[PDB]
PDB file of C-alpha atoms in Angstrom:
ATOM      1  CA  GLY E   1     -62.201 183.112  -7.733  1.00  0.00           C
ATOM      2  CA  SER E   2     -65.995 181.622  -6.906  1.00  0.00           C
ATOM      3  CA  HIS E   3     -65.753 177.526  -5.850  1.00  0.00           C
ATOM      4  CA  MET E   4     -67.943 175.810  -4.669  1.00  0.00           C
ATOM      5  CA  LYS E   5     -65.520 172.622  -3.569  1.00  0.00           C
ATOM      6  CA  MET E   6     -66.618 169.275  -2.278  1.00  0.00           C
ATOM      7  CA  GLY E   7     -64.786 169.296   1.099  1.00  0.00           C
ATOM      8  CA  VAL E   8     -62.189 166.312   0.581  1.00  0.00           C
ATOM      9  CA  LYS E   9     -60.075 169.614  -0.921  1.00  0.00           C
ATOM     10  CA  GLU E  10     -58.008 169.757   2.222  1.00  0.00           C
ATOM     11  CA  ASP E  11     -58.975 166.196   3.167  1.00  0.00           C
ATOM     12  CA  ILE E  12     -57.215 164.560   0.044  1.00  0.00           C
ATOM     13  CA  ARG E  13     -54.211 167.513   0.500  1.00  0.00           C
ATOM     14  CA  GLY E  14     -53.482 166.335   3.725  1.00  0.00           C
ATOM     15  CA  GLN E  15     -53.065 163.321   2.145  1.00  0.00           C
ATOM     16  CA  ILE E  16     -50.892 165.319   0.051  1.00  0.00           C
ATOM     17  CA  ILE E  17     -48.671 166.451   2.526  1.00  0.00           C
ATOM     18  CA  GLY E  18     -48.006 163.365   4.228  1.00  0.00           C
ATOM     19  CA  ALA E  19     -47.847 161.934   1.979  1.00  0.00           C
ATOM     20  CA  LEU E  20     -45.117 164.638   0.445  1.00  0.00           C
ATOM     21  CA  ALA E  21     -42.907 163.990   3.750  1.00  0.00           C
ATOM     22  CA  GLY E  22     -40.130 161.730   3.501  1.00  0.00           C
ATOM     23  CA  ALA E  23     -38.870 162.800   0.228  1.00  0.00           C
ATOM     24  CA  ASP E  24     -35.252 164.399  -0.381  1.00  0.00           C
ATOM     25  CA  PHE E  25     -35.514 168.569   0.541  1.00  0.00           C
ATOM     26  CA  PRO E  26     -39.292 169.795   0.744  1.00  0.00           C
ATOM     27  CA  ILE E  27     -40.153 167.914  -2.303  1.00  0.00           C
ATOM     28  CA  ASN E  28     -37.573 167.819  -4.721  1.00  0.00           C
ATOM     29  CA  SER E  29     -40.011 168.128  -7.961  1.00  0.00           C
ATOM     30  CA  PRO E  30     -42.593 165.205  -8.537  1.00  0.00           C
ATOM     31  CA  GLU E  31     -39.828 162.920  -9.469  1.00  0.00           C
ATOM     32  CA  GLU E  32     -38.830 162.214  -5.781  1.00  0.00           C
ATOM     33  CA  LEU E  33     -41.417 164.069  -3.931  1.00  0.00           C
ATOM     34  CA  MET E  34     -43.505 161.560  -5.489  1.00  0.00           C
ATOM     35  CA  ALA E  35     -40.437 158.875  -4.723  1.00  0.00           C
ATOM     36  CA  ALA E  36     -41.294 159.711  -1.215  1.00  0.00           C
ATOM     37  CA  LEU E  37     -44.882 158.316  -0.836  1.00  0.00           C
ATOM     38  CA  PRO E  38     -45.486 155.669   1.519  1.00  0.00           C
ATOM     39  CA  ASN E  39     -47.490 153.835  -0.798  1.00  0.00           C
ATOM     40  CA  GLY E  40     -43.656 154.140  -3.140  1.00  0.00           C
ATOM     41  CA  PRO E  41     -45.599 153.252  -6.914  1.00  0.00           C
ATOM     42  CA  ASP E  42     -46.762 157.104  -6.527  1.00  0.00           C
ATOM     43  CA  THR E  43     -49.706 156.973  -3.892  1.00  0.00           C
ATOM     44  CA  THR E  44     -53.185 157.829  -5.152  1.00  0.00           C
ATOM     45  CA  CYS E  45     -55.461 160.130  -2.547  1.00  0.00           C
ATOM     46  CA  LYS E  46     -58.753 158.887  -4.411  1.00  0.00           C
ATOM     47  CA  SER E  47     -61.587 159.280  -2.292  1.00  0.00           C
ATOM     48  CA  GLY E  48     -65.314 158.691  -3.268  1.00  0.00           C
ATOM     49  CA  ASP E  49     -64.476 158.535  -6.833  1.00  0.00           C
ATOM     50  CA  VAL E  50     -62.084 161.671  -7.558  1.00  0.00           C
ATOM     51  CA  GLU E  51     -58.269 160.965  -7.620  1.00  0.00           C
ATOM     52  CA  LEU E  52     -55.077 163.345  -7.021  1.00  0.00           C
ATOM     53  CA  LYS E  53     -51.960 162.643  -6.680  1.00  0.00           C
ATOM     54  CA  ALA E  54     -48.012 163.573  -7.956  1.00  0.00           C
ATOM     55  CA  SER E  55     -49.155 161.292 -11.068  1.00  0.00           C
ATOM     56  CA  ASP E  56     -51.741 162.312 -12.110  1.00  0.00           C
ATOM     57  CA  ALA E  57     -51.851 165.895 -10.824  1.00  0.00           C
ATOM     58  CA  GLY E  58     -48.210 166.654 -10.507  1.00  0.00           C
ATOM     59  CA  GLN E  59     -48.412 166.153 -14.338  1.00  0.00           C
ATOM     60  CA  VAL E  60     -48.914 170.086 -14.347  1.00  0.00           C
ATOM     61  CA  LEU E  61     -45.849 171.078 -12.328  1.00  0.00           C
ATOM     62  CA  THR E  62     -43.175 171.411 -15.160  1.00  0.00           C
ATOM     63  CA  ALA E  63     -39.246 170.838 -14.242  1.00  0.00           C
ATOM     64  CA  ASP E  64     -38.956 174.643 -13.048  1.00  0.00           C
ATOM     65  CA  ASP E  65     -40.521 173.496 -10.444  1.00  0.00           C
ATOM     66  CA  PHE E  66     -38.607 171.079  -9.100  1.00  0.00           C
ATOM     67  CA  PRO E  67     -37.440 173.878  -5.814  1.00  0.00           C
ATOM     68  CA  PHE E  68     -40.579 173.774  -4.175  1.00  0.00           C
ATOM     69  CA  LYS E  69     -41.409 175.343  -1.521  1.00  0.00           C
ATOM     70  CA  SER E  70     -41.819 172.942   0.708  1.00  0.00           C
ATOM     71  CA  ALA E  71     -44.830 170.192   0.754  1.00  0.00           C
ATOM     72  CA  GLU E  72     -47.157 173.229   1.755  1.00  0.00           C
ATOM     73  CA  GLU E  73     -47.166 175.400  -1.487  1.00  0.00           C
ATOM     74  CA  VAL E  74     -47.135 171.885  -3.462  1.00  0.00           C
ATOM     75  CA  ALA E  75     -50.409 170.440  -1.813  1.00  0.00           C
ATOM     76  CA  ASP E  76     -52.175 173.663  -2.229  1.00  0.00           C
ATOM     77  CA  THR E  77     -50.257 173.833  -6.003  1.00  0.00           C
ATOM     78  CA  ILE E  78     -50.683 170.344  -7.258  1.00  0.00           C
ATOM     79  CA  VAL E  79     -55.029 170.369  -5.976  1.00  0.00           C
ATOM     80  CA  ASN E  80     -55.322 174.014  -7.387  1.00  0.00           C
ATOM     81  CA  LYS E  81     -53.895 172.753 -11.205  1.00  0.00           C
ATOM     82  CA  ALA E  82     -55.246 169.373 -11.121  1.00  0.00           C
ATOM     83  CA  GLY E  83     -58.683 170.590  -9.882  1.00  0.00           C
ATOM     84  CA  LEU E  84     -59.283 171.424  -5.763  1.00  0.00           C
TER      85      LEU E  84
END
C-alpha cells in the first residue's frame, strides 16, 4: 500500500480524464475511449520521461473492462496498473 509517488499521478491522470472526455459512453473500453483522445492516434500523457496512456497502460485492461465505471474509474484504474 505504501508508495512515495512522484506527484504527477494526479497530473497525468488529469490528462487522462480530459483525454477520455469525448468518447462514446463514459469510457467505451480502450478501443473507444482511446479513440476519443483529442490527439487522435492515442495521446500520450508522458511527462519528464514517464509515459502513460490508454495504449501503453490500457493494455492491462481486458475485454470485460469495456463497461468502465466512467472515465473517473478508468483514470484511477489505469494509473494503478500502469504504475501510478
